[PDB]
Amino acid sequence: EKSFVITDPRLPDNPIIFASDGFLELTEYSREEILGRNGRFLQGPETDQDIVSGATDAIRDQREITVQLINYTKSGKKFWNLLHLQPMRDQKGELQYFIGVQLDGEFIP
Amino acid sequence: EKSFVITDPRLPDNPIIFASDGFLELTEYSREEILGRNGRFLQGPETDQDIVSGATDAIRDQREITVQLINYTKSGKKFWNLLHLQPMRDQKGELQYFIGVQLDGEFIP
């Protein structure tokens, strides 16, 4: 299944309001464990903070970006998360949601 | 002039959407330079990260806080910023804006 989430940047700290079954499977968290949280909950000691701070600034500026960073499953297993973030805008062009796709790393070294 | 800003936590990363003339004067930045930025842009090498972390936790949790931390004017001059951050709620009690007041540090030693 594709792993993706939908966040609402019109709510405080841009929480996840929808998580695909692929995301549950990739992360090992349940839907109850995920919803209402900011995506950074997957991050941990080895995550690159310069990439994180860079993504924060890009997201504030409503840019579409791709980043690759270390995340952790619920049980503490590290994985490379190739994460594509895209604003979704309403009919008038105003930001409504962000879509985050956790892309497969199979052909990514 | 009193120095303050209004941020919008219903836009990603709580950007500054209004800056008082006193804030322009305190920081040396222009209105154009400031709007759309997160307040953290004033921070720099000597800012205390434990205080930053503390503020960030309170803000994400929609709480009122007062902090004191080192900031930098546009030209690189350090000043102590005694910063009071307050949620502003709508008629129903839902978070609408944050007000951040940069209080005068004259009688704060």
Residue numbers in the entry:
A (entry chain A), B (entry chain B): 2 to 110
What did the study's authors say about this model?
By using a flavin transferase and carving a flavinylation motif in target proteins, we demonstrate that “dissociable” flavoproteins can be turned into covalent flavoproteins. Specifically, four different flavin mononucleotide-containing proteins were engineered to undergo covalent flavinylation: a light-oxygen-voltage domain protein, a mini singlet oxygen generator, a nitroreductase, and an old yellow enzyme-type ene reductase. The crystal structures of the designed covalent flavoproteins confirmed the designed threonyl-phosphate linkage. The elucidated crystal structures confirm that the covalent attachment does not significantly perturb the binding and microenvironment of the redox active part of the flavin cofactor.
Except for introducing a threonine residue at the respective positions, analogous to the engineering of PpSB1-LOV, the 6 residues before each site were also mutated to carve a recognition site for the flavin transferase into miniSOG as was done for the LOV protein (47-DAASGAT-53 for miniSOG-F1 and 51-DIVSGAT-57 for miniSOG-F2, respectively). To analyze the effects of covalent flavinylation on the structure of miniSOG, miniSOG-F2 was crystallized. The asymmetric unit contains two miniSOG-F2 domains. As observed for the LOV domain protein variants (vide supra), the structures of miniSOG-F2 and miniSOG are very similar (rms deviation on Cα atoms of 0.55 Å). The mutated residues of 51ATVQKIR57 to 51DIVSGAT57 are clearly visible in electron density. Electron density clearly confirms the introduced phosphoester bond between OG1 of Thr57 and the phosphate of FMN. The isoalloxazine group remains embedded at the same position in the protein. Only the angle of C5′–O5′–P is different and is bending toward Thr57. The phosphate group in miniSOG-F2 is further stabilized by the guanidino group of Arg41. The interaction in miniSOG with Arg57 is not observed, as in miniSOG-F2, it has been mutated to Thr57.
